[PDB]
């Protein structure tokens with residue numbers, strides 16, 4: 042569902058994949074002068090356009106003050122709730138009164 | 139009563155006086171690279187401001 | 188960022204040209220008739236004004252996409268895993 | 284975009300190239316379309332006939348003063364078109 | 375900065391310098407820390423062995439001396455560090 | 466099957482939009498692509514000429530090969546130090562391989578590659594907007610002497626490293642008009658120095674032939690209705706927009722794109738430590754920064 | 767008659783003669799346009815206007 046001039050204008054399953062699909066707004070013009078160039082106009086790179094106004098990442102905009110890490114994608118050290126904890130303490134730890 | 143980054147950050151009775159007093163916010167940093175230079179940061183000259 | 192590949196133009200000297208479908212990424216094709224191409228050396232066809240030119244265009248990945256690229260993900264419900272230090276009496280255990 | 288050649292130390296008024304023939308322009312309508320040398324590209328060693336569109340050697344060719352290629356431009360009206368001519372000089 | 379001398383027209387593979395011993399690094403840790411040459415500052419005349427950290431001649435020393443001194447950079451991870459090596463050519 | 470054998474490859478003439486005389490011309494050095502993705506400001510430029518190789522095609526530093534302008538078109542060689550790169554001022558040349566240059570350039574709105582002095586002294590300029598790049602969250606004109614040594618990506622100066630490949634194809638016809646000679650009502654094919662030349666004529670029908678000497682064409686009266694071009698040109702040429710393709714446009718070979726983008730470490734400045742003032746439920750930070758420096762705050766709730 | 771980059775002054779000089787002198791005047795010159803699109807250099811494919 043590619044859109045010209047926006048993020049994801051070119052897509053593939055991987056960087057080395059051969060089934061690349063794109064819908065950039067490219068169009069071929071009639072050659073004005075009699076040389077052998079190909080005149081064409083294309084929309085801007087939607088990846089570059091997204092980079093220009095990506096805003097701030099989630100490493101800076103995330104509630105509860107916890108930091109976003111990749112490989113794998115995760116949010117570490119988040120302080121938001123309460124955890125019920127049940128401990129089965131071994132009887133060797135106890136002592137008599 | 140010197141203040142960093144403001145007028146009067148360095149003061150003396152005269153231009154040739156040895157009793158110069160100042161409070162420019164000098165912060166000496168640990169040397170990162172393996173050389174002999176002295177890394178430091180300082181507040182901007184309040185006279186220029 | 189895509190790299191736009193403009194292949195070498197096809198020129199057929201007063202014989203009709205058309206182009207077929209391609210599996211290339213964003214393959215855009217157009218044929219222009221009545222051209223008279225020139226290169227360094229002189230004219231390029233033996234035929235006066237019925238010469239045709241086929242122009243191709245597509246896109247691929249830039250050579251520097253191995254570093255500067257973005258990955259799109261759909262994420263599901265997240266699971267919380269915590270590292271706990273438990274000191275009971277005077278025995279300390281670290282676990283996940 | 285036009286390719287022409289001249290020899291070293293060539294006489295004045297000698298043939299260089301037929302611009303109107305190579306462009307496929309009609310011969311009877313150069314003056315009606317206002318054939319003219321472009322003011323940006325003026326070559327003292329070359330001159331073109333407005334009526335016939337044939338380029339000719341104006342001044343005697345010398346590599347020592349030149350050095351290389353000779354560049355010339357022509358422009359036409361109705362429609363507005365521009366063409367470029369480049370001449371190689373042998374030694 | 376870590377500069378040291380190499381003779382003119384020195385043979386290929388001769389001992390030249392020791393990065394690891396001068397920086398207090400062991401073989402195993404630099405193998406784990408990916409002791410590699412920095413891709414910016416590279417010289418065709420010098421290469422390092424990737425496990426011993428010893429610079430040696432790759433290509434024979436010649437008189438053009440690039441511009442003059444020889445410059446090289448290496449970098450390590452955990453912690454991220456950059457080191458510069460300077461080489462004098464004794465003519 | 467990427468190859469490094471440049472004897473099978475030849476340079477070519479491109480159509481530069483801005484030459485030394487400020488108008489488009491056919492040039493032996495034509496700028497095809499410019500890449501600026503390294504964090505140290507270095508750029509990679511693709512040029513129609515081949516650098517680092519001699520006339521024959523073997524690896525020869527300080528020699529570059531290009532295409533001649535003569536009618537008997539052949540491949541010439543020249544010395545490398547007259548190759549100049551510029552954007553607004555002169556650019557340092559960091560490396561060169563066949564079809565590719567790696568340079569360090571100041572910011573500018575155009576990229577120019579020129580052959581200075583000697584024969585074939587020329588230039589090619591393309592509108593390419595490049596600007597100063599940054600790594601960290603503090604701006605800097607120059608890399609600081611004391612910093613943080615963060616990870617960044619730069620172009621490798623070693624030409625053996627590869628960033629990809631370009632496809633190489635058999636060249637199409639060139640059709641020099643000087644091979645044609647007009648006579649009193651007839652035309653002749655005039656090959657140069659006995660090299661074999663193929664002609665295609667449309668006299669009254671499509672006729673194709675191969676000659677080695679001056680040959681009459683019987684049916685044709687004008688030179689514009691027939692063409693002739695050199696034969697046996699099995700030298701691979703890059704798939705450029707300024708060349709008519711061969712009948713068989715299959716990918717004959719692949720050439721490496723040198724100077725790959727590689728990770729490394731590089732310093733970024735550390736700004737002046739702010740002065741913190743505390744007041745009930747708030748803080749006041751006193752900020753000092755010579756260069757633009759990014760400050761980010763977020764609540765922990 | 768010269769082709770000059772943009773600048774805020776005009777200087778004419780003798781580079782290596784016996785005179786060895788320059789003259790500089792204040793003159794604001796900027797880039798000039800023909801159409802309704804800005805361009806650093808004239809394009810190959812255009813409209814060919816007067």
Ligand SMILES: *[C@@H]1O[C@H](CO)[C@@H](O)[C@H](O)[C@H]1NC(C)=O
Pocket residue numbers: 093094
């Ligand atoms: C986009 O980029 C331009 C120049 O690259 C810059 O001036 C501008 O601030 C950026 N952002 C937006 C939202 O236009």
Ligand SMILES: *[C@@H]1O[C@H](CO)[C@@H](O)[C@H](O)[C@H]1NC(C)=O
Pocket residue numbers: 277278
């Ligand atoms: C815990 O404390 C008791 C009494 O102080 C002592 O005897 C015992 O060794 C301690 N256990 C450990 C594991 O340190």
Ligand SMILES: *[C@@H]1O[C@H](CO)[C@@H](O)[C@H](O)[C@H]1NC(C)=O
Pocket residue numbers: 659660661662675677696
């Ligand atoms: C040119 O091609 C012809 C085709 O018949 C061949 O016989 C000849 O050997 C080729 N080479 C020359 C004339 O150098």
